[PDB]
Ligand binder design. Structure first.
Ligand code: NA
Ligand code: NA
Ligand SMILES: [Zn+2]
Lengths: 214, 224
């Protein structure tokens, strides 16, 4: 009803940095904009309400401004705990409506993934299926390309990828890539390769195995 | 301190019903506005229903998306908040949270629960196949895993050696494939310790009352 556009959707920043996040309503909301943060395993917390009033307990490095259709959240000198998902919400009028969020990510040194490949298990082959699995663990930033090669030929069907959220402790990402085939399909070729291209090197990290080296 | 705990979430078919409740504590319940907000997967939080305080005589407001199907109510003596959900739709699938206002500004949410998951689907409760991920035909550290595939509805929990090398485990979120969920989990341990000592993944899927324990074995013969 009042639609709320949050931007940027994603921002990486350093501990000690100051940043600004934006929220824009499709029509005036007077001053009634609230800001929240979300973190995994924690309940949502209100930071600011009525545009610029700090919720009891919010650190003073948070400030809010705006009126009408354009607001902003500023956080000065980021603390580690400030890295989170931030939402805005208008509370001028029903139906209450939220922005889609700004992911505030902690910028750490670039790191290459550790890559591991797994053939399908006996157990899975017995059932008629064949999943080849590649883990790419502990890298940064999250952008990465994985390609799957069967007998040297790029495979672009049946790959599913999944990433973890940024790690609380080391600030890295990890992902799985899984190429799922039928048994028959799996047995008609020999070499299975997953290749990870990540900005830490112009050389892909390559992991393979031969069905018929075992 | 203030606590809100949601419950009653589960799987239903399209056209069924569900009742959610929210156990609230740590404030005078009747002094506050209480709401239900949901987060469908990949989408913005969506406010659904508000019930005001005693001062306001407990009047309600609804989102157009649940109006006439969902009804918010309060048990004031017990400090429980309810959401009765009738004529469920697959688009209703989401994590549902209960929330309380901050007192100064009545249409904000100072406290939330952790949420309860609601699935509306025609898929049937199905337990996972659990497959081991060990290296085939190495160095100082070894990565192992478990592929958990073909389950419904969420969630599953994967425990490695009764919680002991949960510092180096990675849990990959589930994705729907062929109507069913798949996820995997990995753990990284020193080569000094596996295959020398045992490593097991235990996979709980409460929906089907199933727990699978899978020992990771080294590359050995086809025989044995
Ligand atoms: Na690549
Ligand atoms: Na739907
Ligand atoms: Zn071939």
């Amino acid at each position: 009803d009042v639609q709320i556009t949050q931007s940027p959707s994603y921002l990486a920043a350093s501990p000690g940095e100051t940043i600004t996040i934006n929220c824009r309503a499709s029509k005036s909301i007077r001053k009634f904009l609230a800001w929240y943060r979300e973190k995994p395993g924690k309940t949502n917390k209100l930071l600011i309400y009525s545009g610029s009033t700090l919720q009891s307990g919010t650190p003073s490095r948070f400030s809010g401004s705006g009126s009408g259709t354009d607001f902003t959240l500023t956080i000065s000198r980021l603390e580690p705990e400030d890295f989170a998902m931030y939402y805005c919400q208008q509370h001028n009028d029903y139906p209450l409506t939220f922005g889609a969020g700004t992911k505030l990510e902690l910028k750490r040194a670039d790191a290459a993934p550790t890559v591991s490949i797994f053939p399908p298990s006996s157990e899975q082959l017995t059932s008629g299926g064949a999943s080849v699995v590649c883990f790419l663990n502990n890298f940064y930033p999250k952008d990465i390309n994985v390609k799957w090669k069967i007998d040297g030929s790029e495979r672009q069907n049946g790959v599913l990828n999944s990433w973890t959220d940024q790690d609380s402790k080391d600030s890295t990402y990890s992902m799985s890539s899984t190429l799922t085939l039928t048994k028959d399909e799996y047995e008609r070729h020999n070499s299975y390769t997953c290749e990870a291209t990540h900005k830490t090197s112009t050389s892909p990290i390559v992991k393979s195995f031969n069905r018929n080296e075992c | 301190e203030v606590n809100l705990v949601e419950s009653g979430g589960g799987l239903e078919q399209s056209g069924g019903s569900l009742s959610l409740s929210c156990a609230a504590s740590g404030f005078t319940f009747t002094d506050y506005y209480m709401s239900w907000v949901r987060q469908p997967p990949g989408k913005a939080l969506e406010w659904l229903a508000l019930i005001r305080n005693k001062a306001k005589g407990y009047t309600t407001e609804y989102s157009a998306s649940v109006k006439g199907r969902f009804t918010i109510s309060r048990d004031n003596s017990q400090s429980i908040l309810y959401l009765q959900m009738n004529a469920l739709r697959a688009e209703d699938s989401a994590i549902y949270y209960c929330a309380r206002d901050n007192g100064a500004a009545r249409a904000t949410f100072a406290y939330w629960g952790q949420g309860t998951l609601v699935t509306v689907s025609a898929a049937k409760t199905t337990p996972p196949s659990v497959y081991p991920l060990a290296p085939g035909c190495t160095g100082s550290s070894v990565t192992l895993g478990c592929l958990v595939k073909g389950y419904f509805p969420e969630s599953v929990t994967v425990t490695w050696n009764s919680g002991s090398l949960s510092s180096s485990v990675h849990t990959f979120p589930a994705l729907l494939q062929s109507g069913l969920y798949t996820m995997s989990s990995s753990v990284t341990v020193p080569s000094s310790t596996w295959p020398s000592q045992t490593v097991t993944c235990s996979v709980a899927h409460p929906a089907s009352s199933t727990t699978v324990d899978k020992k990771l074995e080294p590359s050995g013969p086809i025989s044995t």
